[PDB]
Design an enzyme around this catalytic site. Structure first.
Site, mmCIF file in Angstrom:
data_model
loop_
_atom_site.group_PDB
_atom_site.id
_atom_site.type_symbol
_atom_site.label_atom_id
_atom_site.label_comp_id
_atom_site.label_asym_id
_atom_site.label_seq_id
_atom_site.Cartn_x
_atom_site.Cartn_y
_atom_site.Cartn_z
ATOM 1 N N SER A 169 4.631 1.064 -9.951
ATOM 2 C CA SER A 169 3.510 1.966 -9.787
ATOM 3 C C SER A 169 2.210 1.281 -10.205
ATOM 4 O O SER A 169 2.208 0.286 -10.934
ATOM 5 C CB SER A 169 3.718 3.248 -10.603
ATOM 6 O OG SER A 169 3.702 2.997 -12.000
ATOM 7 N N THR B 20 3.481 0.428 -17.997
ATOM 8 C CA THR B 20 4.383 -0.682 -17.710
ATOM 9 C C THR B 20 4.160 -1.208 -16.295
ATOM 10 O O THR B 20 4.022 -2.417 -16.085
ATOM 11 C CB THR B 20 5.835 -0.238 -17.911
ATOM 12 O OG1 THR B 20 5.990 0.335 -19.217
ATOM 13 C CG2 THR B 20 6.784 -1.415 -17.782
ATOM 14 N N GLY B 21 4.098 -0.303 -15.315
ATOM 15 C CA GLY B 21 3.922 -0.722 -13.931
ATOM 16 C C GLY B 21 2.634 -1.486 -13.695
ATOM 17 O O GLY B 21 2.600 -2.433 -12.909
ATOM 18 N N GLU C 55 6.749 -15.624 6.281
ATOM 19 C CA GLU C 55 6.339 -15.120 7.587
ATOM 20 C C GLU C 55 5.524 -13.839 7.481
ATOM 21 O O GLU C 55 4.755 -13.532 8.400
ATOM 22 C CB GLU C 55 7.560 -14.880 8.470
ATOM 23 C CG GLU C 55 7.955 -16.079 9.302
ATOM 24 C CD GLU C 55 9.006 -15.744 10.335
ATOM 25 O OE1 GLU C 55 8.877 -14.688 10.993
ATOM 26 O OE2 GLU C 55 9.958 -16.539 10.486
HETATM 27 N N1 LIG Z 1 6.924 7.705 -5.660
HETATM 28 C C1 LIG Z 1 7.155 7.696 -6.978
HETATM 29 N N2 LIG Z 1 6.133 7.659 -7.829
HETATM 30 C C2 LIG Z 1 6.545 7.655 -9.118
HETATM 31 C C3 LIG Z 1 7.832 7.682 -9.602
HETATM 32 N N3 LIG Z 1 7.833 7.666 -10.990
HETATM 33 C C4 LIG Z 1 6.563 7.630 -11.311
HETATM 34 N N4 LIG Z 1 5.732 7.624 -10.222
HETATM 35 C C5 LIG Z 1 4.278 7.582 -10.234
HETATM 36 O O1 LIG Z 1 3.885 6.479 -11.015
HETATM 37 C C6 LIG Z 1 2.818 6.856 -11.921
HETATM 38 C C7 LIG Z 1 3.344 6.811 -13.333
HETATM 39 O O2 LIG Z 1 3.907 5.502 -13.585
HETATM 40 P P1 LIG Z 1 5.390 5.366 -14.169
HETATM 41 O O3 LIG Z 1 6.180 4.449 -13.305
HETATM 42 O O4 LIG Z 1 5.944 6.719 -14.453
HETATM 43 O O5 LIG Z 1 5.090 4.634 -15.560
HETATM 44 P P2 LIG Z 1 5.745 3.391 -16.321
HETATM 45 O O6 LIG Z 1 5.618 2.189 -15.461
HETATM 46 O O7 LIG Z 1 7.079 3.795 -16.843
HETATM 47 O O8 LIG Z 1 4.738 3.229 -17.552
HETATM 48 P P3 LIG Z 1 4.718 3.807 -19.050
HETATM 49 O O9 LIG Z 1 5.750 4.894 -19.088
HETATM 50 O O10 LIG Z 1 3.327 4.314 -19.265
HETATM 51 O O11 LIG Z 1 5.059 2.659 -19.942
HETATM 52 C C8 LIG Z 1 2.343 8.223 -11.417
HETATM 53 O O12 LIG Z 1 1.348 8.083 -10.413
HETATM 54 C C9 LIG Z 1 3.633 8.816 -10.853
HETATM 55 O O13 LIG Z 1 3.394 9.818 -9.889
HETATM 56 C C10 LIG Z 1 8.916 7.716 -8.693
HETATM 57 O O14 LIG Z 1 10.126 7.744 -8.945
HETATM 58 N N5 LIG Z 1 8.470 7.723 -7.373
HETATM 59 MG MG LIG Z 2 7.748 4.920 -18.361
#
Ligand SMILES: Nc1nc2c(ncn2[C@@H]2O[C@H](COP(=O)(O)OP(=O)(O)OP(=O)(O)O)[C@@H](O)[C@H]2O)c(=O)[nH]1
Ligand SMILES: [Mg+2]
Ligand SMILES: CC[C@]1(O)C[C@@H]2CN(CCc3c([nH]c4ccccc34)[C@@](C(=O)OC)(c3cc4c(cc3OC)N(C)[C@H]3[C@@](O)(C(=O)OC)[C@H](OC(C)=O)[C@]5(CC)C=CCN6CC[C@]43[C@@H]65)C2)C1
Ligand SMILES: CC[C@@H](/C=C(/C)[C@@H]1C[C@@H](OC)C[C@H](O)C(C)(C)[C@@]2(O)O[C@@H](C[C@H](OC)[C@@H](O)C(=O)O1)C[C@@H](OC)[C@@H]2O)CO
Ligand SMILES: C/C(=C\c1csc(C)n1)[C@H]1C[C@H]2O[C@H]2CCC[C@@H](C)[C@H](O)[C@@H](C)C(=O)C(C)(C)[C@@H](O)CC(=O)O1
Ligand SMILES: Nc1ncnc2c1ncn2[C@@H]1O[C@H](COP(=O)(O)OP(=O)(O)CP(=O)(O)O)[C@@H](O)[C@H]1O
Ligand SMILES: COc1cc2c(c(OC)c1OC)-c1ccc(OC)c(=O)cc1[C@@H](NC(C)=O)CC2
Ligand SMILES: Nc1nc2c(ncn2[C@@H]2O[C@H](COP(=O)(O)OP(=O)(O)O)[C@@H](O)[C@H]2O)c(=O)[nH]1
Ligand SMILES: [Ca+2]
Ligand SMILES: [Mg+2]
Lengths: 54, 429, 439, 332
Positions: free
Chosen positions: C140, C145-146, C254
């Site tokens: 994300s 983390t993302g 590619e």
């Molecule tokens: N499509 C989709 N979006 C997701 C999902 N889980 C979280 N999100 C989105 O990702 C964002 C939140 O990031 P997360 O992935 O929950 O956070 P993380 O990477 O665990 O980060 P921290 O918990 O803060 O350490 C928001 O915009 C959510 O709507 C999922 O399973 N699918």
């Molecule tokens: Mg998380």
């Protein structure tokens, strides 16, 4: 409309249809940025623990 | 994950006990700490607030502090009083005489290290401690003076854990003691510098709800405290039950507090309806939502219509369609968008939890961070300076070794805090 | 034999990852215990699916994947799910405290302590490879983390694995899809420092995925499970070239060759059709011409924007199932006339076309109906700059007041990093504007 | 109720419309940067179209069509008429014109110049651009486009206009068109004639340019009712037969042409826009399109009704609140 680069395989095929002609850092660098951030954090913690000792 | 809970003084121990009483019932714990619940949803996160003892016994991770024994016996002889760890009672005999200086500097000085020992023993029993929560009043001596001394010492040993307090502000509508504005002002000063999140539970607001809205002609602390426990259960739902939110105290702070000093929250609870012909009506989500945002439902005596919300968290509990909740919450914002600052996009968040509070089919809990909370600090400030202008009742505090300057810089800090709220009330994009 | 390693970071990345690997297994005939009876080479083999699965002497097919999250809640699911038996414990990596929706905490504070362990587990997998071509990274934008850790990982991966390709699958934040108020900060921060380290990024706007589910699938309130199974179809059709005998996009390099003329403008738009609801019993079968057409309607795109008011630099049509070439050219002939497809003058107006005869698989019990033919279109159009403009505006509103800024500074990031990232985004917006304007 | 925001202060027309909205007690204006708005009366240039349609739970409508500038820019209109097959380069209602850069058509213009000058025909040309508020020599027009750093269009000057008597004077016709979110084309029943008090002399830049800026009838404006009677008494014809059929037809062809490009059907936000079409009428009662204006003003008398009409079919159509001055030009 011309077809080129036709490839045929077992699981499908591919080709290209043309319509109109046309007219990094080091490991050191990274770890310095990380250790620098750890510095600022430790400095802030010291400012807090110092103010609390007062 | 794990949270360590501390209750200090008469008020703190009073509402702290009702809190454990109420959430123990929600998680299916009986007064002897045995689990008698149906759903396992009630044990999914039971370790957040409870330690697991030998023999399938859950014991609250609670520390009970007071400078006098009276309330200790009271809690210990009440419903769910046997559930508490007996080592975690730390009390004195002198009492604090509703004097902040006695709680913070003189009498509390001797007991404080005993509390830190129990605090330390519980923290080390935690897999990954996320932080602390404190219940206390600001108008007395122990919870106000010694409670803030505890916060300061705990922050020095755990400088990176989250520090969260449920703090009861004093009101002349409820209490007789003339020096309460003194105790509260000294306490607010400590809270702005050493807590991350503070729920402002105003006895002035609790009184108006019981007297005007609930029509209680002879309100008791039991009435007021049953409002506090309901709200405390509501604001902690997403810690104690799983679902749709992967949230702890730090995440809540990060998204609720846009500026370090502005961490005082305005709480609210729905439903509130006087006895008794309306106590049988079915609540609709539209009604829950209107009640939640109503100024007369707020639990800090301040008119939210006078200011702006920086951030809002709302939590719904019970069986209900999330579609209805979504639409209703968006209606409130789209139709009254001037009460929400526009330089924080999408600044009202919702969580829904399946398990409802005891006795209710549905309920909503409101957590607002609004510039209008300044009205609360102005009220206390006016009472403070009226007295301090003439040094009235100061001798009770200077006789404990305090200086006038300490009062001057506490009032000074609170006046600045007021100023800061005012500056984002007029800040625009 | 050229292998690909998938890295799934944060809740979104792990849950989307879980959905993808499930789909892969259904698509290749791999069962939940790791066996695939159709595989006649036990313990080895140089088949196409082997670029995503290694084989154990016992005949089990292990995904070439790594799962990282800074808190165990989400990964524990994978550790106890239907496909728990398919992974090795060493491929699942969890911390104990997450980034708290805070980029600086994921990148600097927690990231520092866990980066070497992740790199060591990735290294273990690269060692099992004879021709590793690069990485696919799921994450994300808005998570701590993302955003924060993924950035540190990307920087590191360039160092240890220079010249190897890195592709991104990124979830763009949407208030609809539960967003924290600081996700705009995290998004700009992570885009700025990852920009130089990925060669191609497939952006998925949670708002777009949300509406397709409500509109086409008739789902009142889509869950992550609904969103994630729909995203899996798109990922599967994008990667289907790497996992199947084919000729189009057989190597990660590619993707940039075919889709990214300019290095900084490496964000292709994805459109997908048909999305039919499984509850729908009728099941009227669309033609290649109908589904090709649908690729040019905004409501089927992975990001909400209007390609009619931009320019293309590359266009790829990836068909699955009952599709013959004769139909495709005929559809493109029509699509051209009844549509506004303006290419940049420096690129040729054309279409790369791939056809995999195997039709789309569906998760038994999912929400999508089985279809005879489907298209996924990848187009590098300037219209995607709309998503950057939206994001940059939300950033500016908060940043003008320094709201929330203290949370990042307190983790040891300096305030300057904010305005450096924002200036980069300003530059990225100038880049898009220059490539597709004429006045 | 509903909410709207105003982002173009100078708009005389939308300045008016927002007052009708407030008069209903069911609309409220909310600053400019607040995004929780139902309707956006946006700015002339750099309207952030990419920001619309993304606020959860808000049906958003905007008073401009993204892409309609192609019809409202002199240079792009000439390029649109020639390149579009539905209009053809032989399109019989647009004056011959070429885009000249101080893609350029300066070589094709000179070819059509000697083809005429040799042919011994009236070769008066007008030159203009989109940065301004007539000659018979190409050597004098091209050096003008060079002294101005802007792109210019050189268009055939309509040498034999229809003149009004008494006065022997020139004029043009302004039509107001409204396109709603469903792409209905609404023609405002009332038009205005921009008359020139100065008699026309075909051999002085006042009796040739008829717009009100450069300047019998009050305000040099005549209304359709009067002009109708004049055509009846002077030429034994009516306004609908000899002029309005062509105007209606030109308006359809232009808007029908760009509809697939700008239509907001199936888009995450909705659009409408008020256009101004400027026409010429020659001696043989043939109507010529002069230009299309994306941000038109209105005749002082006609600000009501037309503005009240905009709220009726364009705004209240999508946001309903608790006769017809428009002509539905049926299309598609
Ligand atoms: N499509 C989709 N979006 C997701 C999902 N889980 C979280 N999100 C989105 O990702 C964002 C939140 O990031 P997360 O992935 O929950 O956070 P993380 O990477 O665990 O980060 P921290 O918990 O803060 O350490 C928001 O915009 C959510 O709507 C999922 O399973 N699918
Ligand atoms: Mg998380
Ligand atoms: C919730 C805890 C509480 O029970 C709340 C009130 C006060 N105390 C204890 C009980 C109590 C109350 N009144 C008492 C009179 C004698 C002895 C005890 C009481 C209480 C009540 O009537 O319901 C149980 C109460 C008290 C007050 C009270 C209301 C009230 O119950 C309605 N008032 C708000 C104030 C008061 O000062 C006031 O501002 O006027 C309304 C009020 O003044 C008058 C003229 O009523 C009064 C009444 C004795 C006067 C002087 C001291 N102040 C302190 C607070 C105030 C009181 C209730 C604590
Ligand atoms: C929400 C922002 C900020 C203030 C505003 C604008 C809020 C808006 C909505 O809040 C529920 C009110 C809602 O739209 C209603 C009018 C339907 C309604 O519920 O209003 C309350 C009266 C309330 O008195 C306090 C009002 O003044 C108020 O609080 O208004 C009862 C009744 O009045 C007729 C009516 O049923 C409070 O957070
Ligand atoms: C208003 C209430 C319920 C309700 C509203 S509509 C419906 C069908 N039920 C709840 C509110 C609970 O949050 C708790 C605080 C309430 C305080 C009461 C204990 C109060 O002291 C007392 C006088 C009451 O109001 C009742 C005992 C009548 C109580 O049952 C109704 C009430 O307020 O509880
Ligand atoms: N091809 C042409 N032949 C003859 N006269 C023409 C002409 N084009 C323009 N004119 C004259 O010049 C005037 C201005 O027309 P033009 O299209 O340049 O408008 P403009 O954009 O400069 C001002 P406005 O927007 O108010 O019409 C017309 O009213 C007409 O009198
Ligand atoms: C553990 O309990 C809570 C924890 C949090 C939130 C919250 O309110 C819904 C809680 O109480 C119910 C929360 C609050 C406010 C937010 O913005 C003001 C936000 O962006 C985000 C949130 C939460 N995240 C989401 C997507 O709602 C994370 C922190
Ligand atoms: N809401 C509430 N307030 C209380 C309660 N008990 C005391 N207070 C308030 O707390 C203040 C006095 O502090 P108290 O807790 O009695 O003193 P301490 O023992 O020295 O901490 C006054 O404002 C009281 O009204 C209680 O049970 N509920
Ligand atoms: Ca094999
Ligand atoms: Mg007391």
């Amino acid at each position: 409309m011309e077809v080129i680069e036709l490839n045929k395989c077992t699981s499908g095929q591919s080709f290209e249809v043309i319509l109109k002609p046309p007219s990094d850092p080091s490991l050191e660098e990274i770890q310095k940025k990380l250790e620098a951030a750890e510095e600022r954090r430790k400095y802030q913690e010291a400012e807090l623990l110092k103010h609390l000792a007062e | 994950r794990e949270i360590v809970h501390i209750q200090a003084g008469q008020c703190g121990n009073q509402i702290g006990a009702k809190f454990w009483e109420v959430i123990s019932d929600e998680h299916g714990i009986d007064p002897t700490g045995s689990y008698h619940g149906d759903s396992d949803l009630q044990l999914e996160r039971i370790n957040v607030y409870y330690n697991e003892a030998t023999g399938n016994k859950y014991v609250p991770r609670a520390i009970l502090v007071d400078l006098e024994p009276g309330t200790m016996d009271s809690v210990r002889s009440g419903p769910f009083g046997q559930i508490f760890r007996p080592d975690n009672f730390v009390f004195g005999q002198s009492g604090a005489g509703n004097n902040w200086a006695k709680g913070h500097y003189t009498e509390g000085a001797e007991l404080v290290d005993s509390v830190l020992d129990v605090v330390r023993k519980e923290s080390e029993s935690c897999d990954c401690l996320q932080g602390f929560q404190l219940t206390h009043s600001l108008g007395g001596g122990t919870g106000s003076g010694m409670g803030t001394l505890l916060i300061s010492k705990i922050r020095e040993e755990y400088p990176d854990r989250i520090m969260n307090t449920f703090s009861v502000m004093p009101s002349p509508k409820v209490s007789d003691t003339v020096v309460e504005p003194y105790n509260a002002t000294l306490s607010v000063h400590q809270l702005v510098e050493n807590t991350d999140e503070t729920y402002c539970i105003d006895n002035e607001a609790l009184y108006d709800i019981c007297f005007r809205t609930l029509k209680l002609t002879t309100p008791t602390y039991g009435d007021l405290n049953h409002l506090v426990s309901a709200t405390m259960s509501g604001v902690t739902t997403c810690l104690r039950f799983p679902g749709q939110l992967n949230a702890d105290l730090r995440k809540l702070a990060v998204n609720m507090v846009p500026f370090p000093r502005l961490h005082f929250f305005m709480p609210g609870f729905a439903p509130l309806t006087s006895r008794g012909s309306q106590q049988y009506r079915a609540l609709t989500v539209p009604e829950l939502t209107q009640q939640m945002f109503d100024s007369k439902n707020m639990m800090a005596a301040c008119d939210p219509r006078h200011g702006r919300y920086l951030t809002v968290a709302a939590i719904f509990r019970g069986r209900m369609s999330m579609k209805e909740v979504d639409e209703q919450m968006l209606n409130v914002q789209n139709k009254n968008s001037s009460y929400f600052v526009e330089w924080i996009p999408n600044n009202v968040k919702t969580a829904v939890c399946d398990i409802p509070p005891r006795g209710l089919k549905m309920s909503a809990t409101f957590i607002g961070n609004s510039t209008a909370i300044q009205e609360l600090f102005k009220r206390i400030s006016e009472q403070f300076t009226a007295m301090f202008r003439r040094k009235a009742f100061l001798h009770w505090y200077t006789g404990e070794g305090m200086d006038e300057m300490e009062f001057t810089e506490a009032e000074s800090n609170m006046n600045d805090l007021v100023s800061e709220y005012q500056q984002y009330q007029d800040a625009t994009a | 034999m050229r292998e690909c390693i998938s890295i799934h970071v944060g809740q979104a990345g792990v849950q989307i990852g879980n959905a993808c690997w499930e789909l892969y297994c259904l698509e290749h005939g791999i069962q939940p215990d790791g066996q695939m009876p159709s595989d006649k080479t036990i313990g080895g083999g140089d088949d196409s699916f082997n670029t995503f699965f290694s084989e154990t002497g016992a005949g089990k097919h292990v995904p070439r994947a790594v799962f990282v999250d800074l808190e165990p809640t989400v990964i524990d699911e994978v550790r106890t799910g239907t496909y728990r038996q398919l992974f090795h414990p060493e491929q699942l990596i969890t911390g104990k405290e997450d980034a708290a929706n805070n980029y600086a905490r994921g990148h600097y504070t927690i990231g520092k302590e866990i980066i070497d362990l992740v790199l060591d587990r990735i290294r273990k997998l690269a060692d099992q490879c004879t021709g590793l071509q690069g990485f696919l990274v799921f994450h994300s934008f808005g998570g701590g983390t993302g955003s924060g850790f993924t950035s540190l990982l990307m920087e590191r991966l360039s160092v240890d694995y220079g010249k190897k390709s890195k592709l991104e699958f990124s979830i763009y934040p949407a208030p609809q899809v539960s967003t924290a108020v600081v996700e705009p900060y995290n998004s700009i921060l992570t885009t700025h420092t990852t920009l130089e380290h990925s060669d191609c990024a497939f952006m998925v706007d949670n708002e777009a995925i949300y509406d397709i589910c409500r509109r086409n699938l008739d789902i009142e309130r889509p869950t992550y499970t609904n969103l994630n199974r729909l995203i899996s179809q798109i990922v599967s059709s994008i990667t289907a070239s790497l996992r199947f005998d084919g000729a189009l996009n057989v190597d990660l390099t590619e993707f940039q060759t075919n889709l990214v003329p300019y290095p900084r403008i490496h964000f292709p738009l994805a459109t997908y059709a048909p999305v039919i609801s499984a509850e729908k019993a009728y099941h009227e079968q669309l033609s290649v011409a109908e589904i090709t057409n649908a690729c040019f309607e905004p409501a089927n795109q992975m990001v909400k924007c209007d390609p009619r008011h931009g320019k293309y630099m590359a266009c790829c049509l990836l068909y699955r199932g009952d599709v013959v070439p004769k139909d495709v050219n005929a559809a493109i002939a029509t699509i051209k006339t009844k549509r506004s497809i303006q290419f940049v003058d420096w690129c040729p107006t054309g279409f790369k076309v791939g056809i995999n005869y195997q039709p789309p698989t569906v998760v038994p019990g999912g929400d999508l109906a089985k279809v005879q033919r489907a298209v996924c279109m990848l187009s590098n159009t300037t219209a995607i700059a709309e998503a950057w403009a939206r994001l940059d505006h939300k950033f500016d509103l908060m940043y003008a007041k320094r709201a929330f800024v203290h949370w990042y500074v307190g983790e040891g990031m300096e305030e300057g990093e904010f305005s450096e990232a924002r200036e980069d985004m300003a530059a990225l917006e100038k880049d898009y504007e220059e490539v597709g304007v004429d006045s | 109720m509903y909410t709207f925001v105003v982002r173009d202060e100078n708009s005389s027309v939308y300045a008016e419309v927002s007052r009708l909205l407030l008069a209903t007690g069911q609309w409220k204006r909310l600053r400019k940067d607040n995004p929780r708005f139902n309707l956006m009366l946006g700015e002339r240039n750099r309207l952030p179209f990419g920001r619309l349609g993304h606020e959860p739970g808000l049906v958003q409508l905007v008073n401009y069509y993204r892409g309609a500038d192609k019809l409202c820019r002199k240079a792009s209109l000439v390029k649109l008429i020639k390149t579009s097959p539905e209009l053809s380069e032989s399109c019989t209602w647009f004056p011959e014109s070429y885009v000249i850069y101080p893609t350029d058509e300066r070589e094709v213009f000179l070819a059509a110049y000697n083809r005429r000058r040799e042919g011994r025909e009236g070769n008066v040309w007008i030159a203009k651009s989109s940065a301004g508020a007539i000659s018979s020599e190409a050597s004098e027009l091209l050096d003008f486009i060079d002294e101005q750093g802007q792109v210019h269009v050189i268009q055939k000057y309509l040498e034999k206009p229809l003149l009004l008597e008494p006065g022997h004077r020139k004029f043009d016709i302004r039509s107001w068109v409204l396109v709603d979110h469903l792409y209905n084309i609404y023609l405002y029943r009332e038009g205005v004639l921009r008359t020139s008090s100065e008699p026309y002399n075909s051999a002085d830049k006042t009796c040739h340019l008829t717009n009100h800026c450069i300047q019998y009838e009050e305000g040099n404006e005549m209304f359709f009712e009067e002009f109708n009677q004049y055509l009846m008494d002077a030429l034994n014809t009516t306004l609908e037969n000899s002029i309005l059929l062509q105007i209606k037809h030109i308006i359809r062809s232009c808007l029908m042409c760009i509809e697939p490009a700008i239509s907001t059907k199936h888009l995450h936000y909705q659009s409408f826009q008020l256009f101004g079409f400027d026409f010429m009428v020659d001696e043989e009662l043939k109507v010529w399109l002069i230009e299309v204006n994306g941000a038109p003003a209105c005749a002082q008398k006609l600000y009501a009704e037309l503005c009240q009409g905009i709220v009726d079919v364009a705004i209240s159509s999508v946001f309903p609140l608790a006769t017809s001055i428009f002509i539905k030009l049926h299309h598609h």
